[PDB]
Structures are given as C-alpha cells and as structure tokens.
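## Example record

The block below lists the input lines for one assembly entry, exactly as stored, with component labels intact.
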Amino acid sequence: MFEARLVQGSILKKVLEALKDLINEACWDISSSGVNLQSMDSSHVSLVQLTLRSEGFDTYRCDRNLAMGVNLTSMSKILKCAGNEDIITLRAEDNADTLALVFEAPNQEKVSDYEMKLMDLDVEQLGIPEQEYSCVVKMPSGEFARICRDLSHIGDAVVISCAKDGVKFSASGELGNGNIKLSQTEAVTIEMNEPVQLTFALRYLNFFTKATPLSSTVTLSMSADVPLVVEYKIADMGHLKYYLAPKI
Amino acid sequence: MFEARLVQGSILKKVLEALKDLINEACWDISSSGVNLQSMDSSHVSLVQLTLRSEGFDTYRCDRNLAMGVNLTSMSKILKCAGNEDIITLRAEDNADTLALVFEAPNQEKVSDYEMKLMDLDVEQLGIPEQEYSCVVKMPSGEFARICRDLSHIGDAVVISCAKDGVKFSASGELGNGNIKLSQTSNVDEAVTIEMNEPVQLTFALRYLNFFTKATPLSSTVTLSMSADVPLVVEYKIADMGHLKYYLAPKIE
Amino acid sequence: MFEARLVQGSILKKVLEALKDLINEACWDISSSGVNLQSMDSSHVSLVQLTLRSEGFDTYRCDRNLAMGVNLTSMSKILKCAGNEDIITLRAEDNADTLALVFEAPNQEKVSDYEMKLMDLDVEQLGIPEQEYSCVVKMPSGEFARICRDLSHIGDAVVISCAKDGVKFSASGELGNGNIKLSQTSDKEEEAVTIEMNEPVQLTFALRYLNFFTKATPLSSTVTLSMSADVPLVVEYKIADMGHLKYYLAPKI
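Predicted structure tokens for the full assembly:
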C-alpha cells in the first residue's frame, strides 16, 4: 500500500505537463522518502530526473518500495480531469497493476475516482553522477524560456558561451544569425570557476522549458564536454532536473 | 408577415451555436405565441426541442403561421456578423423564401441587414410525450459540461446511476476507468438538487452529451431527467423566454 | 551607414505583421528624411506604401541613400524575438549585405543581436500618382476590420456604395446576401465616422485583399478610405508622429 495526499494538486498537473512531451513511459519509484522518477528520452539525448519528497505531501504512506510503470501521456490526460484547485490523492495496493487517482473538489460535494492501468517496464535506472560545474547560472525561468524559444526560430542549435561578465546564447541558420547576451544584475547570477563554451540542440531545451510553471527561477550548470543540467525547484517538495548531452 | 425584435441578441447567437453541431437543417415554426423548433439529429439518436415565447421578445408580430426551413450552419454564420451587444430583429415578408436578420449596433450608427435564403423541408414533426421522471437532477451547467468532457477522455459511454444521497457518472476504456460522484448541497451559499421517486441506472453516448453542453452559455443551471429505459432529458432554461431541451435515447448492446 | 533607434519598438513589430501577409520581399528605401517602402503583391492586384519619417525615430542617421532588399517574412520572424517593450535599433554598415537588428530589454540586462541577410531586388518602383478623391471616409479601424471580416463570410467581393448620408458595404454568395450601412456621427474622434463626398461612387473589391490590409489595424485607432470611380481604393493607417501605411486595391470587374 501507498497513499499520498497533495492539497496543491496543480503541482502534479504541472509536473506531468513537463514530462509527457519528453517521455512516453516511465517508472515511478515509490519509497518512504518519496517519489523518484528518472528516465531518458526515446532518442537517448537527454535524461530527466524528478524528486518529490514525502514531507512535501500533506500525508504520505509508503509501506513497500514500488516501481510503478506509467504511461505519462495517459496519466496527464487523467490529471486534466482534475480542477486546478482540487485535492489529489494517489493510491496503489501492494500487488497492483493499477494506480488510483482521486480528485476532491474544494466544494466537497464532488469526488472523482480514476483507476489507471499500469505497465511493465524494465528500467534498470542509471544516472548522471553528482559533480561541481565550471559554470552555474541562475535566472528567471520565463527569461530562459523566451531565449530558447526566440533562438529556435533562427537555428536548431544554440552555442552557450559563459565568461565572467555574463553569458551568451547564439544560433545560426537559413535566415541569418542571432545572439543574446545576459549580464549579472528577477536577478541573474553567475558562478564561474572557468570559462566554457558548449553547443546543444534547441529542440530539447524547448521540451525542458515546459517545466517553467513550476518555478520562478532556473539553474543551468555547465562544464566542458559534459551534459548541461537544467534544474527547476519545486518549492518545499523537490526538483525537476534535465540533462542534455552536448552536440558534436 | 413576421417581425420579432429581441430582448437581447446574444441569446440567439448561443441558441444557434448550441444547434448547428447537432442539426444541419431544421424548421422554425413561427406563430402568434412564438418560435418553436423540433428536430432529430441525422443519426436518429437524439431529439432537440426549442421554445421561444413571443412575450420574451421586445416586440413580436406574426400575422400568419410559418414553417421556415433553415440551414442552421448558414444562420449561425450570419449571426457571427452580429456584435454581442447588437439588437437583433428577424423579419420575413408574406411571400418569403428569405429570412431577414437585422443587427443594430448600440451606437446607432451601424445597421447591418442579412437576407438568408430559405428552403422547403417536409418535417412532419413527432415528439416525446410529456411525463414525470423517476429522477430529476438540477445542477450548475458548467459542472455538468466538465463531467461529460472529463469522462469522454476515458470512454465513449457514461453510466449514470441515480440513488438518493447523490448521483454517479462512470466510464471505462483503454486507459482505465473513472467515476464522478455528486452529492446534494444541504448548506448552500451553485447548488446540486435531486428528486428521486425511484433509483435508476442508464447508459448514454458521451459524444451526444458533449453536443448538448454547447448550450451551456444559455443558463447557469441544467436539469437532467431520467427513468428506466427512456430518453434522458437535458434541459436549459432560457430565462423568461423558453427553453432548449435535448432528448437522448439510452445505449444498448 | 545607417542607424535608426526606435524606443517604441512595438511599432515596427506591427508594421511587419501588417506587411508580411501581403508581400514576401520588398525594398526599403533609406534616406536622410527616413524610410520609404513601396511594393505590389505578387498577384499585382494591390500596392502597399510605407512612410516612416526620420524625425519619428529617437535617433536617425543615414549617410547615403539606399535600396535594401529585405525578406519581410524573415524580418517579421526576427522581430518576434523582440519584447513588446524592447528598444529597437536597425543598423547597416557601409557596403554590407546584412541588416543588424538590436533589441534592448527594459531591464537593461538583456541585449539581443540579430543579423539578417539582405537580397538583391530589381524593384524599379512605380506608384499611384497623388490625387483628390470623390469620397473620403474616416472611421474606427476596428469597425472597418469587423465589416470586412463579417462580409467575407458572405461572399468574396464587396460592393462599396458611397452616398452623402452614409456609406454602404454589401456582398453576396451561396448563403444569401448582406449589407452594412454606416451613417455619420453628430464621445471622441476615435469613435466617429466622417464622410466627405464630392460625388457619389460605387465600387467592387476583393475582400481577400481588404482582410490583408486590416492586419495594420493595431497601428491606428482610425482608418481612412478614399474612392473615385474606376480607380484603386486607398486604405490608410496613420502611424502617429512617424508616417503612414497606405494600401491601394484595384477595383474588380
């Protein structure tokens, strides 16, 4: 048995919106410390890592560890049948090939109950090992999104150059080229051990920025020749972290 | 000769949005007492019945009774050329193969005239006879629409079960199942009300209920009426004018 | 060498929205007095004429007179990467095949630089000679846009009839016919309808092309229509303190 109640159910709505465009199917690892999900996209270019701590739920019971295999597209569809003000409860039995999602309306008079079929996934999960990065940029999440959106009209790749003054994003294609230059000050903050220059697929960054509604800020972490880390904090619950292999 | 000026024209915009997705062509029955329209959809699963009383109009003249045959798609397109605050007047002359719609802007300086061609339809109109129902549910129209919309992502059919505490809507398909449970509001401030002679359980096509909820902008509330083995009635009041009523045959094997 | 800074960069955003749906590529004629662009659509039905005076810019430098060939579609796409509150600067170096667009954000911490490739166009520009028109109508730009939009659901052509009382727009097609009748206003000057009639006129024009013109609507509260028998309609939007955007449309036969 597993039972997690979340009063701010919107959070879970946004989490699913943020994932289903990158991943069709993933394993939800439940345990006593909370919910963890970790998965590559189907092109093996990126990895996504989700953490929701048990203590961020309003109540949380997990008696045994569970690897629930979930169609994220299905789950997101069910979560659309939830009001943005609904109270959301997830419930699974020990054996079970189904996950129950229960939506309680603010007015108390409406309760919806969805039983979602699970699926069997063989995800022996590996991850990116923890490390310290040459460059770490903290900035408004909406600003980052607009940058990735703008440049994706110019080319399919973005070169990210981090010096000390600031950081520069540039792209190039059929219709010319563009670059966007950000300086240290809603604040923009930069922590530079050493300069770095990397090239990434904009297609994948625009998937990541679907997490924008979860957080005011976003953190980009870079070193030479290793995956970019794009991280959104989910306040008082955990984080959503995306890793993107550099282009060659 | 026929002339009706409306209490407010948006109402007629909403009526036509509410119909054109269900019916292509219908008869508008005009008389002294007002406007009546009654029609099955083309798959003969449902019936729609519209009543607009003369006394709900601002002025209303009908010297002879008319069955005006209307392309509802066309009429809805013309009504899109009307502002939501426009005053709307329908007009038909004695020898009418055309219906005139006249839109007067609030500022008085813009007047539009549209002449829509009619057609001859041989609608010998049958209807559901009046009756009392085992179950009658009154609820916010928007809540009902959201229910039908939500469940239509789960399956193509909804089982509606009415007991006394409350009413339950459920569906089932590829991706699992769902149900939605509604209770009576005792302590109102948006109320949900239930009148149960005897319990009932029926199954209906969601595709058709989602056509009906296109009437939602007409009314804050909606009334569902049920008995065993007979059409669901879904009714929106058009307050002080009349009503839009849908009937939906139950599903079987 | 050419450099024009515009604090209200939104203006330029709207100008390009207003053009790219009618013209793929055009010549920007730069000089000391400002920016002039003049071009036919590719079906040679209409002409568009843009004027932006140097004095309307916040700073403006043009050392020599220049015909820059621009993909308007490209330029509009780049201008979408500009915030609606950004400061916008255009820059062409001496002898360059590229136009630089530079966007400065209100917060000062973001600066974007886009370099657009230019192209060589052989536009020996012809224009409509200046004249006085039998009929001149000034009216709210949004009202005009709604008229063209409404009537384009009835037919592909609009007959415009100007008498003295007022002006009438009408159309006709499959689903019937429609006409819209506007009178002079005896609140504002940004809600008034004004008519100057030397002599009555009646012309017929393609609605498809009027609905391209009304993409300029966000530039101006008002629009001016100028007509005489057998000559192009002129539809004009003032760009306040800067210039104008003018569209000409050949009459239908």
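The longest helix of chain A spans residues 141-152. The interface with chain B takes residues 71, 74, 77-78, 80-81, 98, 107, 109-117 of chain A (CB under 8 Å).
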